Amino acid sequence: IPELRAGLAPRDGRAVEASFGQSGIWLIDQYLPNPAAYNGPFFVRLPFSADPDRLHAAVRGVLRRQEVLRTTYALSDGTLRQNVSRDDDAVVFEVARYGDDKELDALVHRVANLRLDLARGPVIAVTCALGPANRSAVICNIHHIASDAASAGVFLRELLDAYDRLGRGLPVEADPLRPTYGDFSQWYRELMNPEALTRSLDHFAARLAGELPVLDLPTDRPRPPVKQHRGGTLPLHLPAAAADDFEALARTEGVTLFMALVAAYAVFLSRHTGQRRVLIGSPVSLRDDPATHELIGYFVNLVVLQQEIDDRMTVRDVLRRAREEVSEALRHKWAPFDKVVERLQPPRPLVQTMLVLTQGDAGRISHDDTELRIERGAAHGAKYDLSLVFERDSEGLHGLIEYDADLFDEPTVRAMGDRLRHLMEQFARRPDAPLHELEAL
Amino acid sequence: IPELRAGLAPRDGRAVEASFGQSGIWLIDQYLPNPAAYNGPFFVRLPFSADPDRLHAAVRGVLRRQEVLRTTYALSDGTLRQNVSRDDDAVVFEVARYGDDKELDALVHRVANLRLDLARGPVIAVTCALGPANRSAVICNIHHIASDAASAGVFLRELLDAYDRLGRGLPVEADPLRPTYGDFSQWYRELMNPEALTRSLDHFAARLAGELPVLDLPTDRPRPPVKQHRGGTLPLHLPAAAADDFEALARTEGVTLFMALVAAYAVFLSRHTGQRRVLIGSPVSLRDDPATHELIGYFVNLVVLQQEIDDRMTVRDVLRRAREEVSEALRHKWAPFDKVVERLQPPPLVQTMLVLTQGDAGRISHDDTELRIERGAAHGAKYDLSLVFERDSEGLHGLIEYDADLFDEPTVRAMGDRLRHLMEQFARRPDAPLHELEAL
Ligand SMILES: [K+]
Ligand SMILES: [K+]
Ligand SMILES: [K+]
Ligand SMILES: [K+]
């Protein structure tokens, strides 16, 4: 797998083609809300009161060092292109006040519900929120065509570094040795040469051949003709003990934590739908190369995982079947989801639910000897029926549910969450047990 | 002024043309937020824990009795039509929970940010919010084309009444003797016959002739090429004392409270813009006839008020000049705003607005206890800023709705402070020339 190098894309001024991910995203954009909350608008509470003018000047420094934040999109002869502008002030900005968490959440909602223009920009909004005493907060919305979950950490590190440099009178400018998102976009297209792309597509086309199941969850309402794009969230409240045991199960059985969650979630879905086969989408990070680790952009590909469940399999059986499914999918993870879709020709996609695992250390930023936390807003467009979003660090494993309120009332979701965390507790307690001997509630 | 009668529009099934207001609203409709907060998504805290299934059944009863909630819109031969459906379940509904004010505001925000489809519907969203103890809340979003500020009280009275009737096994059905929004729409077109419409348009075309000023407020940011539809709100915090004196000022000088607010706001704007002439829009209620008082719909027309201010006029001068401008404008208030705009051909007309509601429309009685109608704070900032006043039994108060594309909040807080200061001075020195009312 070749290394990403700066200058791969023409540094002459010619506009680079959008990456596989940007192209799929641009196609669907209808000025909807952010599809998901885990990778959406965010904020960080500061243990000082930030100066608004210098914070704004720090933001312009971040735009200079982060080329995707100055990028708009347009078709040029049948090809979508990334048009980079020199204007480091293309940000939707405001200074506002709050006195408590409710007032802060009101400011977050305003930022989170912007519907940014991809043709003209800006693609980023920032609010400098002034709190009581020595408190303040930065609120940020980056359009998902220009970001992913990890981008939030990148943005805040760049912003706090620029803030501090500008305070010391130092300059804040682009790193010419760092690759851009345009370089990564070209690198991705070179990686997916025609033979390598057919090979990876061929894999998923074989795995997902035939009549695929459509997730059949019990709902409070039928799917409406008009989607209203109204997402809810609900924390799992997975007990710390059960969470620690679930992590212990994973390593004891030789599976990653993610493989374990995928298996338990598949069992949960199989029970609730009465369906043997379940499909779970997962957004896999493409940040393998460390040259991507300080770049804002869409460094993700959605990968489809298929599992077959029945209640005579044991916990250990499903863990090991998830290990094989995840292993092969990750081996072909560079297959762009939208080309997988095009190759499969479903009845117009593939997946109606998603599972995500983040390392909680990506939501932790050190600044001036203190630790800061990246917090997500709760509002989203409910792209899927429901998405399980897990985060694990040394301090423990925890999760939340993002759900489509067009289908579910919140107590239904709380009941689902209640069964899922119970199941996960039984998984760790009885790896040898057949699933039918794991009793409900 | 003819009476509104039920059956004015054919009860045969032929689709009535949209009202003047609905037409203007439909033309602009993209998929933007509610333009303003004062007339936007709302909620009411209930002193019991509502039963979700019966509350949903109550909502279907309101749809049956309130025909605009079952209306969608579509052109048919160059004419916008109100297509009424019999589906009393066309509502964006959910049941959700809250344990404190923050969690409730989270449920309000989700309802408030829906972008309802005018061609397909639903045009209404309702959330049955289950709180702690024996407490709950109803959260509601009705599209601007199908409502006005007063509609929220109509909706909630209908809802609580239906809820109780369904509890006692009684039926909840349409009142055939009550006119519909379709009747009002046809009544409005008959009222604005060609001669009567030309007369009212002629009035505003003469009053508003020439090069109109464009509100020139100091902003923190220039007006952006891409509007982001990001509204803020800021409470004015008008002291009870000054608010009472201000009301007392109005009565003593023989002007309505609204007239007094219009004068003080115009003075405030002239000072902040450096402009002698200021235009203020005001949404005027068209619910004169008591036959409209239990109807949900857009019963409003925007009217443009023009005022000339300089600092040698006294408080009493601007009060009496506001009296004449408002009196004449109200006399021609049926002239549809969009037709006034078409007649004037601007390069619309007003960049700011003033509203006065009677807080008795924001207060409803249920089983001996009084309930308050509360507005969300999110909106699309249709105007640079809008001053929203409400006068109830407890006093007079106001808030500012503002465009965050232009203003940071501390700028708006400083404006609200100068406007509140000015209004106190108005009441203290009605004889004084304005140049003797010093800032701060
Ligand atoms: K502070
Ligand atoms: K505030
Ligand atoms: K909740
Ligand atoms: K309750």
Author numbering:
A (entry chain A): 80 to 427, 433 to 525
B (entry chain B): 80 to 426, 433 to 525
Paper text:
Tomaymycin is synthesized in Streptomyces and Micrococci by an NRPS consisting of the initiation module TomA and the elongation/termination module TomB. The C domain binds two substrate-loaded PCPppant domains—termed the donor and acceptor PCPs—and transfers the growing peptide chain from the donor PCP of the upstream module onto the aminoacyl subunit carried by the acceptor PCP of the same module.
The crystallization construct comprised residues 1 to 533; however, the first 79 residues did not yield resolvable electron density, resulting in crystal structures of only the BC domain (91 to 533) and the preceding 11 amino acids. In neither form was there observable electron density for the first 79 residues. As other canonical C domains, TomB80–533 consists of N-terminal and C-terminal lobes, which adopt a chloramphenicol acetyltransferase fold and are arranged in a V shape. The catalytic tunnel is at the interface between the two lobes and includes the conserved motif 222HHXXXD227, where H223 is fundamental for catalysis. In both crystal forms, the catalytic tunnel of BC is wide enough to accommodate the ppant arm and their substrates at both the donor and acceptor sites. The tunnel is ~38 Å long with a minimum width of ~1.4 Å at the bottleneck, as measured by CAVER 3.0 (29).
